[model samples]
Target: MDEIVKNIREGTHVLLPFYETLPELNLSLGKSPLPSLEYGANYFLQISRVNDLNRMPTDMLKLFTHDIMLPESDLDKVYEILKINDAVVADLSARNKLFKRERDAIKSNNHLTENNLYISDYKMLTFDVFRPLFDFVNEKYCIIKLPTLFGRGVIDTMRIYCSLFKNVRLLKCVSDSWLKDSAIMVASDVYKKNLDLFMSHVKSVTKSSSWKDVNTVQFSILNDPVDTEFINKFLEFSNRVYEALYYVHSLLYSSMTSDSKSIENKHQRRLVKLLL
Candidate 1:
């Protein structure tokens, strides 16, 4: 039992489906003895009729949406997803490794000052190529959200799938990298606490169970139509905001050191202490 649980914990359990009509097949496979368990109960077996098996894929969407938000993961479902996307992940990881080598070389050569690296021109090409897989994974898994600017390229390029299933440390691998590079550092505990608080706020505001909830302003802002003009305008606006944030961040850091020596500057610094 200990061994069985350990294997399961390490995602080594075999999944077996017991068909109602295939009694002989079941007996041949399931009734066999094992070195560990006498009854060969180590595998995860789902007993069901052929009808349910046929409809499994259709019913999977509901199961996916329900289980994805839960605190604890269902390993069987996770394995099912992993198996389906194994080839996709393999291809993506290889591309990412190649990109990383090039990126590291650039860093050593002192060619790039910004954190950004160019890969889509040769490696990824376009987001539409992987949009299907992205939609599938988003349906089956949790999601993410500025940080998005860092991600959209990577996500479009399949870096998310590579990082996600690399070692199956799902939570740690997904959140850690973005948080580390987000410019504002936060401990995991504090991040989780703020995340929980934000979720609660969202729940309180959208109290209704239905998807539609007080969407007057919310819908107008997010659900409004988009085009090249809108996107270009938004990108221009984002550039300005990013520039302001960069200058402000530098100013704050310099202020924290011996640079801000004047009384009025120190007074202003003390006032901005509450901002930090």
Candidate 2:
């Protein structure tokens, strides 16, 4: 097996880009906790933006949205980076208090603006801002949690993320709607058994990639509280990342297969064919 595969298989840390809220399971079994709830090294990047929801897609414009989404009037050049205060295990109640306190503090800032949105303690900075830090880290997978009605927006964002993590093997995508509104979080018996569904999905893909004969199968938790949400986000991000990479790869592949000679400029029957 390749080193990347080994790291991905053994690596627990994941990066969740464009994160919002953390999902929790409403268990009926007298508050039984999730299996795995702590990650020593995982990062979440949240960028809050206000723009026309109906805007069409363009690579250049998509890039601008992320740039302007940075905190403060850093001229798209600065960011306020924060961590979960040495607590790798995210405590929902505790983290909620932290986020609230930070928001309150930001509100009191004289220079704060509506464009500058609030963030959690476990916020991940952008690739441009923290490129060095990310390049040094060895996260094999990236999780991208997205809205339901993506249309072309998702593709644009996927391209942005794909450009960021070109070296990664797994890029997953999860729908924010599913995480927010899905019955899995509502704690059904099926959901309980499928708690590790995210990991299972990863295993399927990884296994497929490894075995030459077997059919590929398709596609964790949280907390100081189960890394369930983290797992979900990681799985989704990885899936989307894969999709984005595949898209790029396919485009490049077709271009490579094209013969440059096909563009030969010539005229049949003198200039008649060229003119016609």
Candidate 3:
């Protein structure tokens, strides 16, 4: 595509790079919300096509954790850019008829898909879990709200899931390419059935028999709001925007637990979040 690495000059100020490695060999580089492994190996040069890895559209396939403990020098530089995005998504039929005429004007046209489980609504609960959906490339933008289980519930059909970004200097292994490179975002079983219906309303707003302990879905989004001050003013506006972007966005909105390697890069799936 015009021989890649195009004109990057905009506001362009970068200082992102990290690693201190004890990450049980590169794949899950010390519990993955990927801020390293050379910004997840320059996110395979922010791949411009293969529908950014077949409609992952920058959710980067659920923060992929190493499929076979990946480290043949960054798995041969992300398999030489995923074999040039699988031969430009198979010898481009004029970019696959504009990616199926942009997925036929968004299947219903109000965007979100995958029933595919779910990002932001007060910085993803002040990150004891979802690390600002992998650093929105330093203030590309971020914000959100739970609403989507569907139509019957309405606060003006409540809306708020925000992101607007460009510039990816290893932008925390992420944080790139969606101001309309086939713009993609739309997934909900109405915000994943309200995440176990807001942990069944925080166990009926706390009956705390050790919060009815059983199904460990990361302790109801990490120790189920460990609640009321309207969920602590939603984790104090998600720890006040990571206390103003932790280290002025160097630690790329810091702290989390995850990682990755390759089972064909587990289908390279850190998937969903759009509205640039």
Candidate 4:
């Protein structure tokens, strides 16, 4: 289990998990991110009996609002979503081998980094999503972000299927999850704390549940039918905010370095003290 988690999170940096940046979802290039998300979302979307992604909002809005869809992914989910995508089995088998290469590298860890030859591949990305239920095994109720990836292209391509069974759909899960993905990211721990606070917020907003409980949580912005023209200013405002943040982050990191390899950066230490 320890071995498996390591591979799934291989290239992830800071907050994004299951977030892969490679233009492609090739496991070899993805550095073998464990439990491929591309595989999972696509699996669900493909088996979908519904007519469109309104069944899944993020994928849907991209089409209805903008006329585009995500790519495809996960060789693996069937029944119970628990069944997982069929292609995922082969994907994981390949993962086993990639992680072995990683295990051997730890033997070379000097503490400066996880591996020497491996500078820790950055050009690639692998995203990971989670449920309140953390685990060494038996992954459940988990979802992924796909980062800049609209998916393994999972978001870019639309998937439809011939329904073999009755009441087959992922509309509610996809819709709610798309909203969850868009909630701001303030680093992992902070984001999680906020999520719990909001879940509590929802419970108060809740009543009784069960398709029965397959409810939809919608995403709204600008309040009053805002248009693209006005969206331009919003984009400008957002850019300025992020630009400011980029500098603060620079200051935060810059305040912490040294000319000597063995020496500590007092500036770095001093800035951290401010937080306390």
Candidate 5:
């Protein structure tokens, strides 16, 4: 399996240049002489716009009623990112309070000999940051094919966090790669089972209801403390579902690049290693 993985890795790298050159070949024929270049330029401009919009500090863009907005088609996709960010902020706030209380509890316990209060607090803090960040990236980018590409840096940080925190094990199973996959599979199954439930919910609230009324009622129901709690628990389970896939992806990425130097190093080494 390792050999196979290595071979696949090398083969992919070998083919990368070919793939990179593909767009230069005027795939549209002579009818559109510069179509490829034009397409590439337009695609890049769209990407730049998305980056700008994402970096915007406010959700005021959502209030804009312009029909020709550049990102209007991608609004749902971008809003999904914002939603995960909000959820993460909420979870992290809750976690910080929990950690403070746990630390105080441990400090007050004179009978107990466990002196790992600081370590516990550290673990909680790590998890507080890790869980939300992972969810933020995953939920926001899951449907996109290259989600993991953008997520690589964050995943590396998480790998280090996982290595450092021992108590991370308790919650680890919930976020473990295989468990996360299973949780998602189960959640998807539930969605299939209760498709009608969603349809019913949509219908009941939508009939003769203004958009504002429907939005307010649905958001209220979903964001109610009890409902949010349940949703968070479900997310905890789904994070486990995705974690397995995330781990496998990271594993594959490392295995593929294990033999490769950084691009700069590769360039320098190529010059030195050439024979006369």
Candidate 6:
């Protein structure tokens, strides 16, 4: 009898006197030599002992709303600015390496200059490209403003999914459970913190006192009430904006330090050709 109890506890089968009586208890007990019986018994007892681990009190499961705001157009511009910044950093690093090599060559040839070879060119190129990108960001301030919407959207989506499957169960002992109330609360809190960080970056840029004048013209001649001449002018302005950004990226990359490579090399190459 002690051997059978030990086997059940250890998930090993050891037939005992009560083994015949287990079948009579209608407990689905298999043959007396069954390893499954011991395994099942041990699992059942362990789960019953820790059943409190799965319980969620009603007071802790409340749902909350998150609010987010940002225009899609402005968000696209933010993404573009980040891409441009990355390109500039990579190009600057590459130029730094090339400058070092060039300085060594000049020194060997007894032709060293008082100024660095790439310093002036790099500054000018970076300024030219960065100025417009920064201006766009300054004008819109979307990156900082959009996170409220971004966070709210993310949180709402998460809650929607969690609530949808909150009641799903696999078996009497196995269930698809919602995360702990504490975890959900933490997620909401963290998302708010993220919004704060995003706003801080925006505020830093705005407070830099580096504002520039930008002239913008909108043409919608090709709309429902189309005017051919106005439509042409609208297309012209659109092409100019595209050309301006394209040329700026190309010029900066061309003057980039040869050691640096673009993350979007193919796109940059195509942009250069388009500008040309």
Which candidate leads in TM-score? 1
Ranking by TM-score: 1, 4, 5, 2, 3, 6
* Model 3 misplaced stretches (Cα beyond 4 Å): 1-9, 26-102, 106-276
**Tens digits of per-residue lDDT for model 4, 85-139:** 4111101011101111212211222332321111112112221221121221232
Which stretches of candidate 5 lie above 4 Å from their native place? 1-201, 204-221, 225-229, 260-276
In the range 217-274, model 5's lDDT, one tens digit per residue, is 1011111112233223333422332333333333322322335533234433322222
Candidate 1 residues 1-276, lDDT tens each? 333223222322111111112111110111111112211111112111111222223223222222112232232343454554422221111211111221222333343432222211122222222222322322333222112122223211222222222211212122111111111110111123322333343345456323331221111001112233423432332233233323333333343333444323553353243222
Clashes of each: 0, 26, 29, 40, 5, 5
Each model's lDDT: 0.24, 0.23, 0.21, 0.23, 0.23, 0.22
Tell me the lDDT of model 3 at 98.
16
Better of 3 and 6 by lDDT: 6
TM-score of each: 0.23, 0.18, 0.17, 0.20, 0.20, 0.15
Best by lDDT: 1
RMSD of 3: 20.7
35, model 1: CA deviation in Å? Answer: 59
**Residue-level lDDT tens digits of model 6 in 222-269:** 112222342233223222222232333333334231234432345444
Candidate 4: which stretches are off by over 4 Å?
A: 1-228, 255-257, 260-263, 273-276
lDDT of 3 by residue, 23-107 (tens): 1111111221312222111122222122222343222332321121122122223335334322100010011111221222123
Which scores greater on TM-score, model 4 or model 6? 4
Q: Kindly state the number of residue pairs that clash in model 6.
A: 5
lDDT of 2 at 233: 53
